[PDB]
């Protein structure tokens, strides 16, 4: 069975693009992230999402943005997408001035707290650290309030996530390319599995620092969806 995706609108796609961080946080600038944000904007525009790009939000602004968006009337919308591009730790996304719990963000969209998205897929796409581990690789009531979320993480739990200053992040590069190629052909989990393969096989870090050289990445699909999701209807 498949989510109903022929509402009048596919839904919103909120892109939070944090590139520049306050000096006092000590966090580096995320060169390449503008490439991701523009790639995502075009990709989801092609899928008929109402894209809203936000740049360099504080932790306060992130919470307020997501509270406000969750309070919109989504009744005519099939789905909801949020893309987070920032520094991170496990369970945490960074605003420009400090951390935000991912749970705080997504709780606004719980099935009991955003009633016009109840039963509709809520997709959270997260390009951020989940820790500091490096992968050295090897040579080869009626429904749950937590239901209908999907978390598409750029990297495995506990691991760094890789970004190229010229091409963008490995994960967002691969996600956009697979959506462009397969969104008219494949169910979403099968698209994300191709993204998993692309990141795992085609990317390997090049660094003058031996600690950071020749490293690998595997994204992590975290699905609490209850139906198949297709980006082509009728």
């Amino acid at each position: 069975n498949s989510y109903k995706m022929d509402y009048p609108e596919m839904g919103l796609c909120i892109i939070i693009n944090n590139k520049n961080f306050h000096k006092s946080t000590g966090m580096t600038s995320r060169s390449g992230t503008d490439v991701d944000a523009a790639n995502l904007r075009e990709t989801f525009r092609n899928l008929k999402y109402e894209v809203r790009n936000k740049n360099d939000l504080t932790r306060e602004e992130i919470v307020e943005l997501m509270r406000d968006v969750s309070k919109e009337d989504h009744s005519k919308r099939s789905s909801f997408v949020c893309v987070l591009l920032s520094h991170g730790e496990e369970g945490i996304i960074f605003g420009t001035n400090g951390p935000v719990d991912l749970k705080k963000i997504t709780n606004f969209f719980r099935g009991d707290r955003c009633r016009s998205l109840t039963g509709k897929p809520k997709l959270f796409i997260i390009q951020a650290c989940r820790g500091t581990e490096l992968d050295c690789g090897i040579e080869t009531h009626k429904i749950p309030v937590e239901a209908d979320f999907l978390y598409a993480y750029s990297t495995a739990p506990g691991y760094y996530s890789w970004r190229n200053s010229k091409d963008g992040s490995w994960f967002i590069q691969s996600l956009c390319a697979m959506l462009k190629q397969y969104a008219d052909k494949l169910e979403f989990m099968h698209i994300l599995t191709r993204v998993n393969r692309k990141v795992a096989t085609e990317f390997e870090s090049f660094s003058f620092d031996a600690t950071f050289h020749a490293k690998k990445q595997i994204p992590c699909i975290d699905s609490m969806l209850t139906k198949e999701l297709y980006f082509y209807h009728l």
Partner: peptide
């Protein structure tokens, strides 16, 4: 290549 850089880590986020």
């Amino acid at each position: 290549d850089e880590v986020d």
